[PDB]
Coordinates of C-alpha atoms and ligand atoms in Angstrom, one line a residue:
Chain A
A1 CA -36.5 -20.8 -9.3
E2 CA -38.7 -20.5 -6.2
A3 CA -41.8 -21.8 -8.5
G4 CA -40.0 -24.8 -9.6
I5 CA -39.2 -26.1 -5.9
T6 CA -42.7 -25.0 -4.8
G7 CA -45.0 -27.9 -4.8
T8 CA -45.6 -31.3 -3.6
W9 CA -42.8 -33.9 -3.8
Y10 CA -42.5 -37.7 -2.7
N11 CA -39.5 -39.7 -2.1
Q12 CA -38.5 -43.4 -2.7
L13 CA -40.2 -44.3 0.7
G14 CA -43.5 -43.0 0.3
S15 CA -43.0 -39.6 2.2
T16 CA -44.8 -36.5 1.4
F17 CA -42.9 -33.1 1.3
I18 CA -45.1 -30.0 0.6
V19 CA -43.0 -26.9 0.5
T20 CA -43.2 -23.1 -0.6
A21 CA -39.9 -21.5 -1.7
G22 CA -40.2 -17.7 -0.8
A23 CA -38.7 -15.0 -2.7
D24 CA -35.9 -14.1 0.1
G25 CA -34.3 -17.9 -0.3
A26 CA -36.9 -19.3 2.6
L27 CA -38.6 -22.7 2.4
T28 CA -41.6 -23.6 4.7
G29 CA -44.0 -26.3 4.3
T30 CA -44.9 -29.8 6.1
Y31 CA -43.3 -33.3 5.8
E32 CA -45.2 -36.5 6.4
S33 CA -43.0 -39.5 6.8
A34 CA -43.6 -43.2 5.8
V35 CA -41.4 -44.4 8.5
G36 CA -40.1 -44.3 12.1
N37 CA -41.8 -43.0 15.3
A38 CA -43.6 -40.6 13.1
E39 CA -47.6 -40.0 12.7
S40 CA -49.3 -37.0 10.6
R41 CA -47.5 -33.9 9.5
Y42 CA -44.6 -32.2 10.9
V43 CA -43.5 -28.5 10.2
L44 CA -40.3 -28.2 8.1
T45 CA -38.2 -24.9 7.6
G46 CA -35.2 -24.3 5.2
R47 CA -33.3 -22.2 3.0
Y48 CA -32.4 -22.6 -0.7
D49 CA -30.0 -20.3 -3.3
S50 CA -32.7 -18.1 -4.5
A51 CA -30.0 -17.0 -7.4
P52 CA -28.5 -20.1 -8.6
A53 CA -26.1 -20.4 -11.6
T54 CA -27.3 -19.8 -15.2
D55 CA -25.9 -22.9 -16.5
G56 CA -27.0 -26.6 -15.8
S57 CA -26.1 -26.6 -12.3
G58 CA -28.5 -27.7 -9.5
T59 CA -29.8 -25.3 -6.7
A60 CA -28.4 -25.9 -3.3
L61 CA -30.8 -26.1 -0.4
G62 CA -31.4 -27.9 3.1
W63 CA -34.3 -28.2 5.4
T64 CA -35.0 -29.4 9.0
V65 CA -38.0 -31.4 10.3
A66 CA -38.1 -31.7 14.4
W67 CA -40.2 -34.9 14.8
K68 CA -42.6 -33.4 17.4
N69 CA -46.2 -32.3 16.4
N70 CA -49.2 -32.4 18.5
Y71 CA -49.8 -36.2 18.5
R72 CA -46.2 -37.5 18.7
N73 CA -42.6 -36.7 19.9
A74 CA -39.7 -38.8 18.8
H75 CA -36.9 -36.4 20.3
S76 CA -35.2 -36.4 17.0
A77 CA -34.5 -34.0 14.0
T78 CA -33.5 -34.6 10.6
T79 CA -31.9 -32.2 8.3
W80 CA -31.8 -32.9 4.5
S81 CA -29.0 -31.1 2.4
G82 CA -29.2 -31.4 -1.4
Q83 CA -29.7 -29.9 -4.9
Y84 CA -33.0 -29.3 -6.7
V85 CA -32.4 -30.2 -10.7
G86 CA -35.1 -28.7 -12.8
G87 CA -36.5 -30.0 -16.1
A88 CA -39.5 -32.3 -17.2
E89 CA -38.6 -34.6 -14.5
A90 CA -37.7 -32.2 -11.6
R91 CA -35.6 -34.1 -8.7
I92 CA -34.3 -33.0 -5.2
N93 CA -31.6 -35.2 -4.5
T94 CA -30.5 -35.3 -0.8
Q95 CA -28.2 -36.8 1.9
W96 CA -29.7 -36.5 5.4
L97 CA -28.4 -36.8 9.1
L98 CA -31.2 -37.7 11.6
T99 CA -29.8 -36.9 15.3
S100 CA -31.9 -38.6 18.2
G101 CA -31.4 -36.9 21.8
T102 CA -29.2 -39.1 24.0
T103 CA -27.2 -39.4 27.1
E104 CA -23.7 -38.3 26.9
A105 CA -22.7 -41.9 27.1
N106 CA -24.7 -42.8 24.0
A107 CA -23.9 -39.9 21.9
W108 CA -21.5 -41.6 19.5
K109 CA -24.6 -43.6 18.1
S110 CA -27.0 -40.6 17.9
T111 CA -26.8 -39.8 14.3
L112 CA -27.7 -41.8 11.4
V113 CA -26.9 -40.9 7.7
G114 CA -28.7 -41.8 4.6
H115 CA -30.0 -40.4 1.1
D116 CA -33.4 -39.4 -0.3
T117 CA -34.5 -38.5 -3.7
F118 CA -37.7 -36.7 -4.1
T119 CA -39.9 -36.6 -7.3
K120 CA -42.3 -33.6 -8.1
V121 CA -45.8 -34.3 -8.5
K122 CA -48.0 -31.2 -8.0
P123 CA -47.4 -27.3 -7.7
Chain B
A1 CA -32.3 -27.0 28.6
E2 CA -35.1 -24.3 28.8
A3 CA -34.6 -21.2 26.7
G4 CA -31.0 -21.8 27.1
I5 CA -30.4 -22.5 23.3
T6 CA -31.2 -18.9 22.7
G7 CA -27.8 -16.9 22.6
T8 CA -24.8 -16.5 20.7
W9 CA -22.6 -19.5 20.2
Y10 CA -19.1 -20.1 18.5
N11 CA -17.4 -22.9 17.3
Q12 CA -14.0 -24.1 17.1
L13 CA -13.4 -22.3 13.8
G14 CA -14.2 -18.7 15.1
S15 CA -17.6 -18.8 13.5
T16 CA -20.6 -17.2 15.3
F17 CA -24.4 -18.1 15.3
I18 CA -27.0 -15.9 17.0
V19 CA -30.3 -17.8 17.6
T20 CA -33.8 -17.4 19.3
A21 CA -35.3 -20.6 20.1
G22 CA -39.3 -20.1 19.8
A23 CA -41.6 -21.7 22.1
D24 CA -42.8 -24.3 19.7
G25 CA -39.9 -25.6 18.1
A26 CA -38.5 -22.8 15.7
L27 CA -35.1 -21.7 15.5
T28 CA -34.1 -18.2 13.7
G29 CA -31.1 -16.0 13.8
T30 CA -27.9 -15.1 11.8
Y31 CA -24.6 -17.0 11.3
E32 CA -21.3 -15.5 10.3
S33 CA -18.5 -17.9 9.1
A34 CA -14.8 -17.5 9.2
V35 CA -14.3 -20.3 6.6
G36 CA -15.2 -20.9 2.9
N37 CA -16.7 -18.6 0.2
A38 CA -18.4 -16.5 2.9
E39 CA -18.6 -12.7 3.6
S40 CA -20.8 -11.3 6.4
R41 CA -24.0 -12.6 8.0
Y42 CA -26.2 -15.0 6.7
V43 CA -29.9 -15.9 7.8
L44 CA -30.4 -19.1 9.4
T45 CA -33.6 -21.1 10.1
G46 CA -34.0 -24.3 12.1
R47 CA -36.1 -26.7 14.4
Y48 CA -35.6 -28.2 17.7
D49 CA -37.3 -30.5 20.2
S50 CA -39.4 -28.0 22.4
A51 CA -40.5 -31.0 24.7
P52 CA -37.1 -33.3 25.6
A53 CA -37.2 -36.3 27.4
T54 CA -36.7 -35.9 31.3
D55 CA -34.2 -38.5 31.4
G56 CA -30.6 -37.1 31.2
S57 CA -30.7 -36.7 27.3
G58 CA -29.9 -34.1 24.9
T59 CA -32.3 -31.7 22.9
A60 CA -32.4 -32.6 19.4
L61 CA -32.1 -29.6 16.7
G62 CA -31.1 -28.8 13.3
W63 CA -30.8 -25.6 10.9
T64 CA -29.8 -24.4 7.5
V65 CA -27.8 -21.8 6.1
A66 CA -27.9 -21.3 2.3
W67 CA -24.6 -19.0 1.4
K68 CA -26.1 -16.3 -0.2
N69 CA -26.6 -12.8 1.0
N70 CA -26.2 -9.2 -0.3
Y71 CA -22.4 -9.7 -0.6
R72 CA -21.9 -13.0 -1.8
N73 CA -23.4 -16.2 -3.4
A74 CA -21.5 -19.4 -2.7
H75 CA -24.3 -21.5 -4.6
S76 CA -24.3 -24.0 -1.5
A77 CA -26.3 -24.8 1.5
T78 CA -25.0 -26.3 4.9
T79 CA -27.4 -28.1 7.2
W80 CA -26.3 -28.9 10.8
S81 CA -28.0 -31.7 12.7
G82 CA -27.1 -32.4 16.4
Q83 CA -28.2 -32.1 20.1
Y84 CA -27.8 -29.3 22.7
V85 CA -26.6 -30.2 26.2
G86 CA -27.3 -27.5 29.0
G87 CA -25.6 -27.5 32.5
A88 CA -22.5 -25.4 33.5
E89 CA -21.2 -25.4 30.0
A90 CA -23.9 -25.6 27.5
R91 CA -22.8 -26.9 24.1
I92 CA -24.3 -27.9 20.9
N93 CA -22.6 -30.8 19.1
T94 CA -23.2 -31.4 15.4
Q95 CA -22.6 -33.0 12.3
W96 CA -23.0 -31.0 9.1
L97 CA -23.6 -31.7 5.3
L98 CA -22.5 -28.9 2.9
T99 CA -24.2 -29.2 -0.7
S100 CA -22.8 -27.0 -3.5
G101 CA -25.0 -26.8 -6.8
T102 CA -23.1 -28.8 -9.5
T103 CA -23.6 -29.9 -13.1
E104 CA -24.8 -33.6 -13.0
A105 CA -21.2 -34.6 -13.9
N106 CA -19.8 -33.6 -10.7
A107 CA -22.8 -34.5 -8.4
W108 CA -20.8 -37.3 -6.9
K109 CA -18.4 -34.9 -5.3
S110 CA -21.1 -32.3 -4.5
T111 CA -21.3 -32.9 -0.4
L112 CA -18.8 -32.4 2.4
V113 CA -19.5 -33.9 5.7
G114 CA -18.0 -32.6 9.0
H115 CA -18.6 -31.9 12.5
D116 CA -18.7 -28.5 14.8
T117 CA -19.2 -27.9 18.5
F118 CA -20.6 -24.7 19.7
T119 CA -19.8 -23.1 22.9
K120 CA -21.2 -19.6 24.5
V121 CA -17.5 -19.1 25.3
Chain C
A1 CA -21.4 -65.9 2.0
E2 CA -17.9 -65.5 0.8
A3 CA -18.8 -66.8 -2.7
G4 CA -22.1 -64.4 -2.9
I5 CA -19.7 -61.4 -2.4
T6 CA -16.7 -62.8 -4.5
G7 CA -17.0 -61.5 -8.0
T8 CA -17.0 -58.5 -10.3
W9 CA -19.2 -55.4 -9.5
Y10 CA -20.0 -52.3 -11.0
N11 CA -21.6 -49.2 -9.8
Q12 CA -23.8 -46.5 -11.4
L13 CA -20.8 -44.4 -12.3
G14 CA -19.0 -47.2 -14.5
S15 CA -16.5 -48.3 -11.8
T16 CA -15.3 -51.8 -11.4
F17 CA -14.7 -53.7 -8.2
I18 CA -13.1 -57.0 -8.3
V19 CA -13.1 -58.6 -5.0
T20 CA -12.5 -62.1 -3.1
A21 CA -14.2 -62.8 0.1
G22 CA -11.9 -64.9 2.1
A23 CA -13.1 -67.4 4.7
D24 CA -11.7 -65.5 7.9
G25 CA -14.0 -62.4 6.8
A26 CA -11.1 -60.8 4.5
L27 CA -11.9 -58.8 1.4
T28 CA -9.1 -58.1 -1.2
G29 CA -9.2 -57.0 -4.8
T30 CA -8.8 -54.2 -7.1
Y31 CA -11.0 -50.9 -7.7
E32 CA -10.9 -49.4 -10.9
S33 CA -12.7 -45.8 -10.7
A34 CA -14.6 -43.9 -13.8
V35 CA -14.0 -40.6 -12.0
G36 CA -11.7 -38.2 -10.0
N37 CA -8.0 -38.1 -10.3
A38 CA -7.8 -41.9 -10.7
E39 CA -6.1 -44.1 -13.4
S40 CA -5.9 -47.8 -13.7
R41 CA -6.4 -50.1 -10.7
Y42 CA -6.0 -49.5 -7.2
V43 CA -5.6 -52.2 -4.2
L44 CA -8.5 -52.6 -1.9
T45 CA -8.5 -54.1 1.4
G46 CA -11.7 -54.6 3.8
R47 CA -13.6 -56.9 6.0
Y48 CA -17.2 -58.5 6.0
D49 CA -19.3 -60.3 8.6
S50 CA -18.7 -64.0 7.7
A51 CA -21.3 -65.5 9.7
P52 CA -24.3 -63.2 8.9
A53 CA -27.9 -63.6 10.2
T54 CA -30.1 -66.7 8.8
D55 CA -33.0 -64.5 8.0
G56 CA -33.5 -61.8 5.1
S57 CA -30.8 -59.6 6.7
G58 CA -27.9 -58.0 4.4
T59 CA -24.3 -58.7 5.4
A60 CA -22.4 -55.9 6.6
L61 CA -18.9 -55.2 5.1
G62 CA -16.6 -52.2 4.2
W63 CA -13.4 -51.7 2.2
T64 CA -10.8 -48.8 1.7
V65 CA -8.9 -47.9 -1.3
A66 CA -6.0 -45.3 -1.0
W67 CA -5.9 -43.5 -4.4
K68 CA -2.2 -44.2 -5.1
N69 CA -1.0 -46.7 -7.5
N70 CA 2.3 -46.9 -9.7
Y71 CA 0.9 -44.4 -12.3
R72 CA -1.2 -41.8 -10.0
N73 CA -1.3 -40.4 -6.4
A74 CA -4.4 -38.5 -5.7
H75 CA -3.4 -38.1 -1.8
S76 CA -6.7 -39.3 -1.0
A77 CA -8.6 -42.6 0.6
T78 CA -12.1 -43.7 0.2
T79 CA -14.0 -46.2 2.6
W80 CA -17.1 -47.7 1.4
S81 CA -19.5 -49.0 4.3
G82 CA -22.6 -51.0 3.3
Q83 CA -24.3 -54.5 3.1
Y84 CA -24.5 -57.1 0.6
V85 CA -28.1 -58.2 -0.3
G86 CA -28.0 -61.5 -2.3
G87 CA -30.8 -63.0 -4.4
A88 CA -30.9 -63.4 -8.2
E89 CA -30.2 -59.5 -8.2
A90 CA -27.3 -59.2 -5.9
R91 CA -26.4 -55.8 -4.8
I92 CA -23.9 -54.3 -2.4
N93 CA -25.7 -51.0 -1.1
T94 CA -22.9 -48.5 0.2
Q95 CA -22.4 -45.1 1.6
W96 CA -18.8 -43.7 1.5
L97 CA -16.4 -41.0 2.6
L98 CA -13.4 -39.8 0.5
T99 CA -10.8 -37.8 2.7
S100 CA -8.1 -35.8 1.0
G101 CA -4.8 -35.1 2.9
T102 CA -5.3 -31.2 3.5
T103 CA -3.2 -28.4 5.7
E104 CA -4.7 -28.0 9.1
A105 CA -6.4 -24.8 7.9
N106 CA -8.5 -26.9 5.2
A107 CA -9.4 -29.8 7.1
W108 CA -12.8 -28.7 7.5
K109 CA -13.4 -29.4 3.5
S110 CA -11.5 -32.8 3.6
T111 CA -14.2 -35.2 3.4
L112 CA -16.8 -35.9 0.9
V113 CA -19.8 -38.2 1.8
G114 CA -22.0 -39.9 -1.0
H115 CA -23.7 -43.3 -1.9
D116 CA -23.0 -46.2 -4.4
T117 CA -24.9 -49.3 -5.5
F118 CA -23.3 -52.2 -7.0
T119 CA -24.6 -54.9 -9.4
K120 CA -22.7 -58.0 -9.8
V121 CA -21.8 -59.4 -12.9
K122 CA -19.3 -62.2 -12.8
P123 CA -18.1 -64.9 -10.1
Chain D
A1 CA 4.9 -38.7 9.0
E2 CA 7.4 -41.6 8.0
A3 CA 6.6 -45.0 9.8
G4 CA 4.9 -42.9 12.6
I5 CA 1.5 -44.4 12.0
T6 CA 2.6 -47.6 13.3
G7 CA 1.9 -47.9 16.9
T8 CA -0.8 -47.8 19.7
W9 CA -3.4 -45.2 19.4
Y10 CA -6.4 -44.3 21.6
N11 CA -9.4 -42.5 20.9
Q12 CA -11.7 -40.2 23.1
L13 CA -13.9 -43.1 24.2
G14 CA -11.2 -45.6 25.5
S15 CA -10.8 -47.8 22.4
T16 CA -7.3 -48.9 21.5
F17 CA -6.2 -49.7 17.9
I18 CA -2.7 -51.0 17.3
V19 CA -1.5 -50.9 13.6
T20 CA 1.3 -51.5 11.6
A21 CA 1.8 -49.3 8.4
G22 CA 3.4 -51.3 5.5
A23 CA 6.0 -49.4 3.0
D24 CA 3.6 -49.8 0.4
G25 CA 0.4 -48.5 1.6
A26 CA -1.1 -51.2 3.7
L27 CA -2.5 -50.9 7.4
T28 CA -3.0 -54.2 9.5
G29 CA -3.6 -54.3 13.4
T30 CA -6.3 -54.9 15.9
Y31 CA -9.0 -52.8 17.3
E32 CA -10.4 -53.1 20.9
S33 CA -13.7 -50.9 21.5
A34 CA -15.1 -49.8 24.6
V35 CA -18.7 -49.2 23.3
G36 CA -21.4 -50.9 21.5
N37 CA -21.7 -54.9 21.0
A38 CA -18.2 -55.5 21.4
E39 CA -16.2 -58.0 23.5
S40 CA -12.4 -58.2 23.1
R41 CA -10.1 -57.5 20.0
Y42 CA -11.1 -57.5 16.2
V43 CA -9.1 -57.6 13.2
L44 CA -8.7 -54.5 11.3
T45 CA -7.3 -54.0 7.5
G46 CA -6.8 -50.5 5.7
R47 CA -4.8 -48.5 3.4
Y48 CA -3.0 -45.3 3.6
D49 CA -1.0 -42.7 1.2
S50 CA 2.4 -44.1 1.3
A51 CA 3.8 -41.1 -0.9
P52 CA 1.9 -38.0 0.9
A53 CA 2.5 -34.5 -0.5
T54 CA 5.4 -32.4 0.8
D55 CA 3.6 -29.5 1.5
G56 CA 2.2 -29.2 5.2
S57 CA -0.8 -31.6 4.4
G58 CA -2.1 -34.7 6.3
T59 CA -1.7 -38.4 5.2
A60 CA -5.0 -40.0 4.0
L61 CA -6.0 -43.4 5.4
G62 CA -8.9 -45.6 6.0
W63 CA -9.4 -48.9 7.6
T64 CA -12.3 -51.4 8.2
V65 CA -13.5 -53.4 11.4
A66 CA -16.3 -56.2 10.8
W67 CA -17.4 -56.7 14.4
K68 CA -17.2 -60.5 14.6
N69 CA -14.6 -62.2 16.7
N70 CA -14.4 -65.9 18.3
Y71 CA -16.6 -64.1 21.1
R72 CA -19.0 -62.0 19.6
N73 CA -20.8 -61.1 16.2
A74 CA -22.5 -57.8 16.2
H75 CA -23.4 -58.1 12.2
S76 CA -21.9 -54.7 11.6
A77 CA -18.9 -53.1 10.2
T78 CA -17.4 -49.6 10.7
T79 CA -15.1 -47.9 8.2
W80 CA -13.1 -44.8 9.3
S81 CA -11.7 -42.2 6.9
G82 CA -9.2 -39.6 7.8
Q83 CA -5.7 -38.3 8.0
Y84 CA -2.8 -38.6 10.1
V85 CA -0.6 -35.6 11.0
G86 CA 2.7 -36.1 12.7
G87 CA 4.7 -33.7 14.7
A88 CA 5.1 -33.5 18.5
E89 CA 1.6 -34.7 19.1
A90 CA 0.5 -36.9 16.2
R91 CA -3.0 -37.6 15.8
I92 CA -5.5 -39.3 13.2
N93 CA -8.7 -37.3 12.6
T94 CA -11.3 -39.5 11.4
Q95 CA -15.1 -39.5 10.3
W96 CA -16.7 -43.0 10.4
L97 CA -19.7 -44.9 9.0
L98 CA -21.1 -48.1 11.0
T99 CA -23.5 -50.0 8.8
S100 CA -25.7 -52.9 10.3
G101 CA -26.8 -55.8 8.3
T102 CA -30.8 -55.2 8.4
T103 CA -33.8 -56.7 6.5
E104 CA -34.6 -54.4 3.6
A105 CA -37.7 -52.7 5.6
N106 CA -34.9 -51.1 8.1
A107 CA -32.2 -50.5 5.5
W108 CA -33.1 -46.6 5.7
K109 CA -31.7 -46.6 9.3
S110 CA -28.8 -49.0 8.9
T111 CA -25.8 -46.4 8.9
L112 CA -24.5 -44.4 11.9
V113 CA -22.0 -41.6 11.2
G114 CA -19.6 -40.2 13.8
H115 CA -16.1 -38.8 14.1
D116 CA -13.1 -40.1 16.3
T117 CA -9.7 -38.5 16.8
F118 CA -6.7 -40.7 18.0
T119 CA -3.7 -39.7 19.7
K120 CA -0.9 -42.1 21.2
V121 CA -1.7 -40.7 24.8
Ligands
LIG201 N1 -38.9 -39.6 4.5 C1 -38.1 -40.2 5.3 N2 -38.2 -40.8 6.5 C2 -37.0 -41.2 7.2 C3 -35.9 -40.6 6.1 C4 -35.0 -39.6 6.8 S1 -35.8 -38.9 8.5 C5 -36.9 -40.5 8.7 C6 -38.5 -40.4 9.5 C7 -37.9 -40.4 10.8 C8 -39.3 -40.2 11.3 C9 -39.3 -40.0 13.0 C10 -38.0 -40.9 13.6 O1 -38.2 -42.0 13.9 O2 -37.5 -40.2 14.3 N3 -36.5 -40.0 5.2
LIG202 N1 -18.5 -22.8 10.7 C1 -18.5 -23.7 9.8 N2 -18.1 -23.1 8.7 C2 -17.7 -24.2 7.6 C3 -18.2 -25.6 8.5 C4 -19.5 -26.1 7.8 S1 -20.3 -24.7 6.7 C5 -18.6 -24.1 6.3 C6 -18.6 -22.6 5.9 C7 -18.8 -22.7 4.3 C8 -18.9 -21.3 3.8 C9 -19.7 -21.3 2.1 C10 -18.6 -22.1 1.2 O1 -17.4 -22.1 1.2 O2 -19.1 -22.7 0.2 N3 -18.5 -25.1 9.7
LIG203 N1 -16.5 -45.4 -8.1 C1 -16.5 -44.2 -7.5 N2 -15.7 -43.1 -7.8 C2 -15.8 -42.1 -6.9 C3 -16.9 -42.7 -5.9 C4 -16.4 -42.7 -4.3 S1 -14.3 -42.4 -4.5 C5 -14.3 -42.0 -6.1 C6 -13.3 -41.8 -7.0 C7 -12.2 -41.0 -6.6 C8 -11.0 -41.1 -7.6 C9 -9.8 -40.5 -6.9 C10 -9.9 -39.1 -6.4 O1 -10.4 -38.3 -6.9 O2 -9.3 -38.9 -5.2 N3 -17.0 -43.9 -6.4
LIG204 N1 -14.1 -46.1 18.8 C1 -15.4 -46.3 18.4 N2 -16.1 -47.2 18.9 C2 -17.6 -46.8 18.4 C3 -17.3 -45.7 17.2 C4 -17.6 -46.2 16.0 S1 -17.5 -48.0 15.9 C5 -18.0 -48.1 17.4 C6 -18.0 -49.6 18.0 C7 -19.3 -50.4 17.6 C8 -19.2 -51.7 18.1 C9 -20.2 -52.7 17.6 C10 -21.7 -52.5 17.6 O1 -22.1 -51.9 18.5 O2 -22.4 -52.6 16.5 N3 -15.7 -45.5 17.6

């Protein structure tokens, strides 16, 4: 459901995710991180399944944030891959990958992996 | 480096990805996979660092593909996170996460992880 | 601390992890999973940092379970990588990789990734 | 397949791993890395499927290395999860997780993920 996803969400670290789910399966919005070499809002773009299953299955989605805005550039990008689970307590459960640009030599230590859970607050 | 991300790339599995990199960090294009519950092209959208470091570092990027098009709906989405390295042989080294929408019961087994390397060859 | 780690632990899915931390950095014990093509106990082996930092840092560790015992064989193995955090509420926070043996053709869909949190019950 | 996992393997980064595979699924040996806060050999322990499927499937395995030896202590541990494929050119394809002990504050950035391919060459 696009409307289900559309809104303001927050995760356990205190980050803000403002997203709009478009009818063609598009996701656009802004991300505000509570951690890292990150200041202010960052543009996010993603995709979700706009025709999910009619049973109790989550809606698959994913989005990317490149950590560069007009104030900072961390030379890194995070992709979140997960599912939206609707109900009274709507959640987005994700696993993420954070890759930093590196020299060829340090490429083996370029990617962090973790997981985030988002709770919806507003539309 | 420079507009070099724009182009048609191919990975080890025969998948093709056509992308346009916008001056300000946007990535847009299509993806056509050769594996999984996939048939035809799919829209892709992502972001990349449009001001990378001057030292010899790669360009951080990432993109998403929801596997639903007019033909098929696999109820899943893959995100690729990596970095582009230009030169005589430009390549995009990535790690990816593929999440399938599941019931809560099967949520523990909802995400696959792998790696793909793309070249313009 | 070996004694801190040694004991009975359980995670959010209802699985049991019985482990002994040896003085040389070794971990041995048994795992009982509440999910998958898994029945009864399985042998686990792992390693942990037996000389961790004197500040509030967790203790790094990891272990493997090959899902084959005398009753079942799932042809798969899981490795858990994480940290032990001591206190009154001792936890082991992990991220895991589950690889299934596959044909070359299906190798791209051989590995699942997830995360588990363990709470200690007994010594 | 068979006792073929036993041996000395090498990965793309120059690391060497010497392993003995026990009849019942145990893996024991040493690892010597060429990258990170590492100096000399480290003990490794793991498990593998000692009764793999007869169809053309790989042998599931995994092992752990805590990065502490008599010389160095990096306060970290890496786990590799993958599968062995025998043949004219045997190889072990793996994905790994490297966790560093951190304060709670930095727990979000405690784990690196990558992939390594080992051959006997
Ligand atoms: N809300 C979250 N913040 C951290 C995790 C995943 S990405 C990350 C922020 C990184 C900030 C910029 C950086 O350090 O590169 N979730
Ligand atoms: N080129 C790639 N194709 C496979 C891997 C990761 S994404 C995947 C295709 C999956 C298609 C949809 C599905 O089976 O659910 N990389
Ligand atoms: N306690 C847990 N059980 C599942 C996760 C990670 S490994 C897994 C069990 C798999 C059981 C055997 C299998 O299906 O291959 N944690
Ligand atoms: N052969 C490999 N070496 C690096 C990757 C994953 S494990 C890593 C070595 C890390 C050494 C310890 C450290 O820096 O903390 N594979």
